[PDB]
Amino acid sequence: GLSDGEWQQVLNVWGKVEADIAGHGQEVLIRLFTGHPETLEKFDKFKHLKTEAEMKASEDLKKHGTVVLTALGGILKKKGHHEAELKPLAQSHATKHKIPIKYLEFISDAIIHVLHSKHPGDFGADAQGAMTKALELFRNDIAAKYKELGFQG
């Protein structure tokens, strides 16, 4: 788990995200899709996006970014008491969306990258450590649910 102090860092960082949730979510998704093109293929509604310019110009992608980070934010605000939020998310992504767990590692790295890119010098080592632990906890709890389902992807 995270300590009190670690959760406080996570949620302080998350205030950065919340000041521009769509812009952060867009940049996270673009980072994921350009670094790991296999991820894009899982999105029927973004798989038409051929270039980063088109990605950056898609208003639906920005909208989706808000959906994604709102769901994550609400989970992080539970400080690990997230079973009801996180179970359905896990099950949806294993059964419907067919998303390998590995893709949660990719997006965790993307979030760290984007935070440094948008907040250079304002995402220090303690904050990074705390956010990394929270994203590990998130994916670890999703992986437990994937194991229940047998789901590899």
Curated annotation (Swiss-Prot):
Stretches assigned to the Globin domain: 1-147
GO MF annotation, one: oxygen carrier activity
The UniProt entry, under CDD domains, shows: Mb (cd08926)
Where is nitrite annotated to bind? 64
Q: What is this protein called?
A: Myoglobin
Q: Could you tell me the gene encoding this protein?
A: MB
**Purpose:** Monomeric heme protein which primary function is to store oxygen and facilitate its diffusion within muscle tissues. Reversibly binds oxygen through a pentacoordinated heme iron and enables its timely and efficient release as needed during periods of heightened demand. Depending on the oxidative conditions of tissues and cells, and in addition to its ability to bind oxygen, it also has a nitrite reductase activity whereby it regulates the production of bioactive nitric oxide.
Indicate the family of this protein: Belongs to the globin family.
The residues the record assigns to binding heme b are: 93
Q: Which residues carry this modification: Phosphoserine?
A: 3
Q: How is this protein organized at the quaternary level?
A: Monomeric.
Gene Ontology process terms (BP): oxygen transport; removal of superoxide radicals
- Entry binding sites for O2: 64
The top of its lineage is: Eukaryota, Metazoa, Chordata, Craniata, Vertebrata
